[PDB]
Design a protein around this ligand. Structure first.
Ligand SMILES: C[C@@H]1Nc2nc(N)[nH]c(=O)c2N2CN(c3ccc(C[C@H](O)[C@H](O)[C@H](O)CO[C@H]4O[C@H](COP(=O)(O)O[C@@H](CCC(=O)O)C(=O)O)[C@@H](O)[C@H]4O)cc3)[C@H](C)[C@@H]12
Ligand SMILES: C[C@@H]1Nc2nc(N)[nH]c(=O)c2N2CN(c3ccc(C[C@H](O)[C@H](O)[C@H](O)CO[C@H]4O[C@H](COP(=O)(O)O[C@@H](CCC(=O)O)C(=O)O)[C@@H](O)[C@H]4O)cc3)[C@H](C)[C@@H]12
Ligand SMILES: C[C@@H]1Nc2nc(N)[nH]c(=O)c2N2CN(c3ccc(C[C@H](O)[C@H](O)[C@H](O)CO[C@H]4O[C@H](COP(=O)(O)O[C@@H](CCC(=O)O)C(=O)O)[C@@H](O)[C@H]4O)cc3)[C@H](C)[C@@H]12
Ligand SMILES: NC(=O)c1ccc[n+]([C@@H]2O[C@H](COP(=O)([O-])OP(=O)(O)OC[C@H]3O[C@@H](n4cnc5c(N)ncnc54)[C@H](OP(=O)(O)O)[C@@H]3O)[C@@H](O)[C@H]2O)c1
Ligand SMILES: NC(=O)c1ccc[n+]([C@@H]2O[C@H](COP(=O)([O-])OP(=O)(O)OC[C@H]3O[C@@H](n4cnc5c(N)ncnc54)[C@H](OP(=O)(O)O)[C@@H]3O)[C@@H](O)[C@H]2O)c1
Ligand SMILES: NC(=O)c1ccc[n+]([C@@H]2O[C@H](COP(=O)([O-])OP(=O)(O)OC[C@H]3O[C@@H](n4cnc5c(N)ncnc54)[C@H](OP(=O)(O)O)[C@@H]3O)[C@@H](O)[C@H]2O)c1
Ligand SMILES: [Li+]
Ligand SMILES: [Li+]
Ligand SMILES: [Li+]
Ligand SMILES: [Li+]
Ligand SMILES: [Li+]
Ligand SMILES: [Li+]
Lengths: 289, 289, 289
């Protein structure tokens, strides 16, 4: 049986990125939909549960994506709600790379910190997109005190409240409208993550290298100019004085390996669910080696 | 040459169901379009008739689908109108499973009735969707007196009039707004089909098991609660007193085999046309074995 | 690695034609987008440059199409603008077959004319679509005096001005509102190309066969009635008195071979750019044999 991946994207069109990685991860064919909503996804899922039986069921799987974390969560829940009994296929959520990237980045930082970040302070700059929101979630699950920042308080609050409802944690929000406010927000922090939109600097060199409390910084933006000044994108725990840095390509290598591995697993059973909990567990295992 | 199926769906997006079955039926690649109309389909068909020659022509084919039977018919006619001379590929119409499901269900019921339903009365409840409309068509072609019912008279009339124009038959329409009216409509019938939308009961157990005239009931809805009360979805002629029942999975197994077989045939010549007439002929042959 | 072609079409949906030829030309999978614009294409390109490394980069490529030449040019420039350093894949522009068809047709006519059309007069009737616009461009690059005609002066001027800006040439525009005006426009011409929309005659037999200056005529329309009266679609330099004619199928055979060859080349490196200049160079080489 051909391994068929159905890609349900909440954006207007399906992500190109997710298509390439789906093929490299083991799908035989990818069929993508945009504009997916909780209401229209049920009929799509029906197509995955009424077309194959027995051993063949596991050769169809579902991937949910898009650029709005909360919307992706709602579509993913609607997918799971449509299943019943043995009428199900494996499914994965990874809006904008949120789960796979955050899992890779947080796993790498936690490992570099010695295996625990409990009680330490983490600041996620521009944390209101999918990647920042999943980063905040995973850091809070590791027991860090997390501040999720954005240019406008209410959008940062909505992101933090979404994280707190989905993960039963207590991330706090802060408004950092400009460079000076972002530089103030990292003072006293132990860990800083930059999850800004592509091709933007959020944290200049002088805003982190002189802050004694900061132990590790991590940047997800791969397109120059990098999210963090004073680092290289390939950094993977590189030392800068007494601090360490992870750049977007250092994180991205693990994110890609993890994403590809999850795709393959979608076709190994008809019962898999790949979201933050499972993807982060796998990321920590992969970071060990 | 790769076997390329072009899926032209009248709905906003192409059916997932039809993608899976197309791959399992023998397509190498499926490319799907939504929002297809009689006006925009011609340029799509041009892409199928000007790109390959000779032996390679039969390796491209067209599948038309969607949720509106009349719209599917009009797109399918526009496909056939665009062809000329040897500039053609094989084509299939199966909006919402209408042809393949109705052919399977009617073939199974006709066989169970001894090979003829001529002169007997058939009632199609919720018969205004594609499946009910093709069921009514095939029953009328077998010489049954058919009543096509829906909640509102005018929509039922439009469905019956569409059937009668396409098939040159004389199906009649009836309004059955609620349970009590549906129960009245089956009185005196020999055959009852339920073609309601997914996950709805249309005919409770008490509304058919005490009607002496009813010989066979058939339900297309596979999602609980089933369209007919008092039966199991896997029933395939199971006896209930002096009556027999076909459930959605009993019908669906044949529908799937038939749909897959038609896909394979699309690539065996560049001249095939698969609609009710051909699909029902094949269904009756397949039901024999 | 699977050879993945990403098809970015400026029309509402991706061209079926371009899908078939992409598969026959060597793509393993084609994923198509409509409604592509210079603003939304960057994120699509990101998916092609951040997902594969090293030897695998060349196994992803981009194809830009659609029915508006100027729009295709702008999307293609936005694709190239998104690349940086080694972060790139091969790309091709062929809106509506413009480059591959014009290259085939012009290469065949130039060859039949003895290898040069410098200083001669070429008229492109209905030259405002992608095919006519690229034909005018290539003829002007060969040193012909080109008049690009359409039913309305301003649309013809916009097409000529687009050609002149992209190719640094000096095509002129003319209004030919009807048959009589088109017949007047070809008087004194040496070469006449008909690039009208499908299924339309633009140049009746009597409008070219009695014009002593005309040496070669070429018609791109394959659907009867042909763009030029008095010729056959398979003509490939067939003599009519002292003149020669190329019909749409004579041109189309080379266009198809050329288009397929370009697709294969997209996967031979991650640095290829296939637009008028490169495609015409290849067409002239292919026409030699
Ligand atoms: C919701 C689906 N949408 C469709 N949509 C389209 N376009 N065509 C169809 O035929 C269907 N259906 C076909 N249906 C359907 C068909 C067969 C089986 C049987 C199962 O497929 C077997 O029981 C196993 C083998 O696989 C179940 C449901 C669905 C109720 C239904
Ligand atoms: C309507 C089509 N739309 C397109 N659309 C796009 N995007 N690109 C194209 O090149 C075309 N065309 C190319 N055209 C075209 C090209 C070649 C042949 C020749 C045939 O392909 C051979 O005669 C046989 C081999 O196959 C015919 C028509 C069509 C008139 C036309
Ligand atoms: C713009 C892209 N959009 C996405 N979109 C989605 N849906 N998911 C993602 O994970 C990403 N990204 C993942 N990102 C990303 C991930 C890994 C690498 C690393 C490279 O892939 C290696 O350096 C080579 C191996 O290939 C680079 C960028 C992009 C910045 C970013
Ligand atoms: N390395 C990897 O493996 C990998 C994987 C996936 C994604 N990425 C990258 O990770 C980053 C985050 O991804 P994402 O999907 O969460 O991003 P996103 O949704 O595109 O943007 C994240 C946030 O950036 C902020 N922002 C936008 N424009 C800004 C500006 N001009 N100044 C300051 N802040 C601005 C916004 O927050 P506010 O409006 O609240 O201020 C926005 O919510 C992106 O660069 C993405 O490419 C990397
Ligand atoms: N077993 C198989 O092989 C197979 C294959 C294909 C499809 N199916 C199933 O067959 C059934 C019919 O398919 P279809 O495409 O024709 O269905 P559909 O178009 O989705 O719905 C059929 C009709 O159901 C009626 N309906 C909708 N909501 C209703 C309600 N609340 N109460 C009463 N009637 C209601 C409507 O008729 P009115 O508005 O006129 O009342 C509608 O036209 C579906 O359940 C589908 O999943 C089964
Ligand atoms: N043989 C091959 O290899 C090949 C390859 C690709 C395309 N084709 C064919 O080449 C032709 C040109 O392609 P294209 O994409 O450039 O075409 P197009 O954009 O669809 O149409 C070209 C022009 O035709 C004119 N036109 C439209 N309706 C007309 C009418 N009723 N009377 C007179 N003129 C009319 C319009 O010009 P104005 O509005 O300015 O008058 C329009 O811009 C088409 O027939 C296409 O199918 C052939
Ligand atoms: Li607020
Ligand atoms: Li900053
Ligand atoms: Li009426
Ligand atoms: Li009822
Ligand atoms: Li003008
Ligand atoms: Li004319």
């Amino acid at each position: 049986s051909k391994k068929l991946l159905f890609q349900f994207d909440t954006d207007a069109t399906p992500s190109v990125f997710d298509v390439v990685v789906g093929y490299d991860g083991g799908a035989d064919h990818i069929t993508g939909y945009g504009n997916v909503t909780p209401d229209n996804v049920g009929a799509y899922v029906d197509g995955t549960i009424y077309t194959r039986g027995g051993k063949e069921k596991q050769s169809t799987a579902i991937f949910v994506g898009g650029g709005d974390m909360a919307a992706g969560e709602r579509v993913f829940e609607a997918v799971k709600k449509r299943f019943f009994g043995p009428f199900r296929v494996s499914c994965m959520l990874d809006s904008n790379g949120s789960n796979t990237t955050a899992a890779a980045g947080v796993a790498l930082v936690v490992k570099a910190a010695g295996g625990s970040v409990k009680g330490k302070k983490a600041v996620v700059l521009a944390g209101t997109g999918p990647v920042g929101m999943r980063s905040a979630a995973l850091l809070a699950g590791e027991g860090a005190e997390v501040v999720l920042c954005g240019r406008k308080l209410d959008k940062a609050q909505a992101a933090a409240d979404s994280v707190n409802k989905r993960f039963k944690v207590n991330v706090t929000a802060a408004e950092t409208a400009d460079d000076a406010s972002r530089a103030e927000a990292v003072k006293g922090a132990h860990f800083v993550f930059t999850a800004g939109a592509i091709g933007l600097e959020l944290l200049p060199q002088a805003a982190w290298q002189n802050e004694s409390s900061i132990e590790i910084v991590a940047d997800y933006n791969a397109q120059p100019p990098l999210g963090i000044g004073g680092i290289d994108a390939t950094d993977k725990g590189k030392e800068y004085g007494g601090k360490r840095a992870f750049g977007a390509l250092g994180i991205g290598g693990l994110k890609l390996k993890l994403h590809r591995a999850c795709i393959a697993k979608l076709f190994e059973s008809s019962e898999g669910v790949f979201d933050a909990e499972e993807i982060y567990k796998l990321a920590k295992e992969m970071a060990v080696d």
